[PDB]
Ligand binder design. Structure first.
Ligand SMILES: NC(=O)C[C@H](N)C(=O)O
Ligand SMILES: NC(=O)C[C@H](N)C(=O)O
Lengths: 368, 353
């Protein structure tokens, strides 16, 4: 019944010859530069671990640490602070160059190695029986930035990653401030790279990224800016200018940001969250806001292949980009379902319904 | 009768990370529903959890007995194996028994179901071929069937071939369904693959274990019940052929040492046939039973956790026997620095009849 559809029915589904294989619940928020909710799927306020989708907030805390500017991190270094990189040789090399800029060593890192986020890099490592180490961590840039901050303020470096350290006090405050939340409304766990990692309502992830894009707009327009807004504009510009530092070759975030050529930034969170900050455009105005826009998505069960398909579908439905811009992402939008003998056996479909405009006022939209 | 909201939930520091909807059916030897999670009649692609039904169609084909397939061979017919060297070797030995060659196979190679095997392949620049297919044993069996009735081999995998007619008929008969109540797609190994209500998958495996109980007891058995008993015995005796080293199905079957068989379906279905036992009697049935599970979003890690939790709640096996599956039951959640970051919980409740 098309007239009784509900947020609990917002799914992405794979089929085999039209027979349902898997289904995945979708949550999404689309917000303006103040965080006002414009459009949604599922539960737009779902309490959600942002994971590395919070890295730009961490980068901001680093860049606002007094004395960090003296180290001379450049835009590519800052993009690496914002990264979940593929551990390509260029990422490892930039991590080492950033350590050198602060006169630290790999032994000062408190993150550990892991298999690469890139299948092609992992393949090279397997052939050499290479064991990744701290300097290969997908989060190495943020860890180097945290060490830089710890050094700059005269804190110890030994536990820069622990919650009682002033660098982590700074991160925690910065995250809550960007979300416009009280500290008690942000919860904290520990991430795979051994840093505190925040959870907050999903819409507030979109709010962070709307603020990034909004700051980019104000900077480009030559408006006088607070030190925080200037830093948020710098982070936006760094990510958009060096999107390969943020992820790597063949990675969704890199292909997405290259396709849009400065119009937006986007960032993956592990276990299938995604955040996009969209600069003001004809598209955002058609969506009904006079400023920048933020988008946040979570696939409830954590499937990344479905995440990229859903994010690309949502961009198409919001009219963000051109068919030509978004077709650089076609392999993520409609994932290949081809068996071992070259036969297409099924596909992906998007039975979810954006809400925010039409329905009978007696239709309840219960966030679920 | 509305399906419960049954989930397995992962957390990070007590904060919800992912959740996964669980469907499960526990059925007696006639397929009567005894316990359930979620929607026990969910229309579900059985994928390779249907392999024992396909092995039954092979074994019932006229003349297949003359090739001399043994119990390990039949286990391979029932398998989604890890493409270990010993699985490839047995595939080749089975092809030799029917005087066929790898070129006759109509399945294709793929990355191994074992990450460890696949890393060894990557290290050696190895490109998997037809003989490496996790379904190679079933394909050799279907080739053997085609040859045995003189059907000719080029399209043994196609729906219009009498071998697939036999498979299609056998699946519906084991489910006790009309042909129209089974739907058909195409699998990764390029065979027809069935979808039917999830409880009927449990019914297949209850019939497998019931047949083993009746064979053991010396009962008069149909040729079909005799063959189902043989399939059960083949899987339990050669569980390494069904999957491989470190695989859940192999470790599950070794742990239970003949009390049950279990089989994975791709995209996170699972089926178990349990021979009659003190545990099954405690659950309120006088015969064998079947268990079928589907994780709605297709997550395999969560599948194995849920299946092992279900076995604990059902009392199937001793605590000592189930502890061999501890690493599947509560998957590790330890970060790159050795710190435990989270866990898995099972807020579902089995509902009974
Ligand atoms: N990259 C992410 O989203 C978080 C991951 N667990 C990490 O810290 O490496
Ligand atoms: N192994 C399974 O469950 C089916 C798999 N896609 C295959 O045909 O190889």
């Amino acid at each position: 019944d098309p007239f009784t559809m509900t947020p609990s029915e917002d799914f992405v589904v794979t089929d085999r010859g039209g027979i349902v294989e898997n289904s995945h619940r979708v949550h999404a928020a689309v917000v303006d530069a103040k965080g006002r909710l414009l459009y949604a799927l599922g539960n737009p306020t779902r309490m959600t671990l942002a994971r590395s989708a919070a890295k730009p907030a961490q980068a901001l805390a680093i860049l606002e640490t007094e004395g960090v500017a003296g180290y001379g991190f450049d835009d590519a270094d800052i993009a690496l602070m914002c990264a979940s990189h593929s551990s390509e040789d260029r990422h490892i090399a930039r991590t080492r160059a950033m350590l050198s800029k602060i006169k630290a060593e790999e032994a000062d890192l408190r993150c550990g190695g892991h298999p690469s986020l890139s299948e092609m890099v992992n393949r090279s490592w397997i052939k050499q029986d290479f064991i990744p180490t701290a300097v290969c961590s997908n989060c190495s840039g943020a860890h180097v930035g945290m060490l830089a901050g710890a050094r700059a303020i005269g804190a110890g470096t030994d536990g820069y990653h622990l919650p009682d350290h002033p660098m982590q006090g700074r991160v925690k405050r910065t995250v809550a401030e960007l979300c416009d939340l009280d500290a008690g409304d942000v919860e904290w766990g520990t991430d795979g790279c051994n840093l505190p990692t925040p959870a907050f309502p999903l819409d507030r992830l979109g709010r962070i990224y709307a603020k990034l894009a909004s700051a980019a707009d104000g900077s480009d327009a030559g408006e006088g800016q607070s030190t925080r807004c200037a830093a948020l504009a710098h982070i936006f510009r760094a990510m958009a200018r060096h999107p390969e530092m943020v992820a790597g070759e063949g990675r969704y975030c890199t292909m997405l940001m290259r396709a849009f050529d400065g119009a937006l930034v986007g960032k993956l969170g592990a276990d299938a969250s995604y955040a996009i900050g969209v600069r003001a455009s004809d598209a955002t105005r058609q969506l009904g806001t006079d400023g920048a826009l933020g988008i946040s998505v979570k696939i409830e069960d954590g499937n990344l292949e479905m995440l990229y398909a859903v994010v690309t579908e949502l961009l198409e439905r919001l009219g963000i980009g051109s068919p030509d811009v978004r077709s650089q992402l076609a392999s993520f939008h409609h994932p290949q379902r081809v068996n071992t003998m070259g036969v297409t056996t099924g596909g992906v479909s998007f039975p979810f319904k954006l809400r925010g405009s039409v329905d009978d006022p007696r239709l309840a939209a219960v966030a679920r």
